Amino acid sequence: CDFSEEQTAEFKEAFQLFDRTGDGKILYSQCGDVMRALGQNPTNAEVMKVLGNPKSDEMNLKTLKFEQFLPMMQTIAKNKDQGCFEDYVEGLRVFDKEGNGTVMGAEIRHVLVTLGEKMTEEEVEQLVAGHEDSNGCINYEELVRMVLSG
């Protein structure tokens, strides 16, 4: 495998933190959580593709191991379709009306819930939380800068 052992040890240590799985295994639905916590930013489509296009019911009746999870993360790191933050900060400007580097939080919540891969109301609230202001607007630039540092 084209992956050093130094970071592999830390990856194994992080994967062993779940525990709640019977033993050294991992569920299909919980695979994305461990894949996104270690690093990278895979999408739902990418997760379903690397997982071999699992069935709807297969996401809760089977479990994988680490020998199969390592190549998944390897491919996600090597092969990816993400992009830098320069394109993200410029994409959110489409919703800016006045053009003063601010956008309404409700519009961002709606765009995140409907447009794209859709997100639950529990996640969008935590995402937009903290950036509350008097005018109810959230600077997309600061939002992207904070999300990139996460």
Partner: protein, 147 residues
């Protein structure tokens, strides 16, 4: 490739384990060579050298026993540092617990202060702000009188 890659990982671990056993067996086999050579040379020894070496065994035995003191002392520092490290790691954890609450406390103070400060200013933003609608309505009402 991903499925076959798992076989390489299992084979790599087995190769490393097999290679480790070869190195361990090499040291064991090499030890027998030196041990066997000492047996043949010990039989043809002069004799007096055997008794002389015994005098050094008691001195060397004390060194092995003395090593237990350093081993226990080294383990003590390792256990003392590890034991103290747990209290140090829990210190940052305890401070981190308050750090998360202290951070929210500052927001609570601002939210608590605003509950009264913004409340008093909000009053001016109600009857006085309503004057804006009344002022705008006054122009409309005055427009009716002007009409």
């Amino acid at each position: 490739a991903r499925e076959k890659e798992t076989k390489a990982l299992s084979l790599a671990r087995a190769l490393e384990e097999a290679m480790e056993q070869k190195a361990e067996l090499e040291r064991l086999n090499k030890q027998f060579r030196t041990e066997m050579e000492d047996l043949m040379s010990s039989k043809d020894d002069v004799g007096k050298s055997v008794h002389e070496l015994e005098k050094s065994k008691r001195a060397l035995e004390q060194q092995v026993e003395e090593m237990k003191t350093q081993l226990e002392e080294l383990e003590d520092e390792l256990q003392a540092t590890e034991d103290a490290k747990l209290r140090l790691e829990v210190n940052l954890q305890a401070m981190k617990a308050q750090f998360e609450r202290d951070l929210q406390g500052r927001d609570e103070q601002s939210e608590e202060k605003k509950k009264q400060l913004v409340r008093q200013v909000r009053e001016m933003e109600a009857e006085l702000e309503d004057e804006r609608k009344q002022r705008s309505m006054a122009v409309a009402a005055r427009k009716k009188l002007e009409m």
